[PDB]
């Protein structure tokens, strides 16, 4: 966007040397065919666990029975004879 | 004592596999790839952000 001077005027651009027309053209840079290498192995021997783990620790419980229930001698009250 | 010590540091994971187990001269190795020095006689950096 530039304003064109009318009192010193200029034309477009003249030819100037070169850089050499060929040298400037690059080659299309063939690619050959090619391979992950080698046969891979179906698993890893991982250094971590692959599961989830837990943050709390739950106690847990099992049932346990008691054994034969006895019989027992009482201390026996005394007669309700209207003193009670 | 600078590394004079100690065999070598790891961090293994469940008695199962060792993940840096390098001895202490290649340990502090690894520190100046990060601080650009060495910590003092006897401190060590392990770095896991």
């Keep these: 966007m530039a304003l064109i001077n009318p009192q010193f005027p200029y034309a477009g651009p003249v030819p100037i040397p070169g850089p050499a027309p060929t ?3 690059p080659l299309l840079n063939y690619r050959v065919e090619g391979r992950i290498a080698g046969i891979q192995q179906a698993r890893q021997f991982m250094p971590f666990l692959q599961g ?4 709390v620790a739950e106690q847990t419980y099992y049932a346990i029975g008691t054994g034969i229930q006895m019989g027992q001698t009482f201390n026996q009250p005394l007669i309700n004879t209207q003193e009670g | 004592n600078a590394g004079t010590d100690i065999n070598y540091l790891s961090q293994r994971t469940a008695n199962f596999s ?4 390098l001895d202490p001269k290649t340990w502090a190795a690894q520190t100046r790839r990060r601080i650009a020095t060495d910590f003092p006689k ?4 392990c770095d896991n952000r």
């Design chain 1, 52 to 55: 989830p783990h837990r943050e």
């Design chain 2, 18 to 21: 060792d993940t840096r187990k």
């Design chain 2, 42 to 45: 006897g401190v060590y950096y």
């Design chain 1, 23 to 25: 040298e400037t053209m």
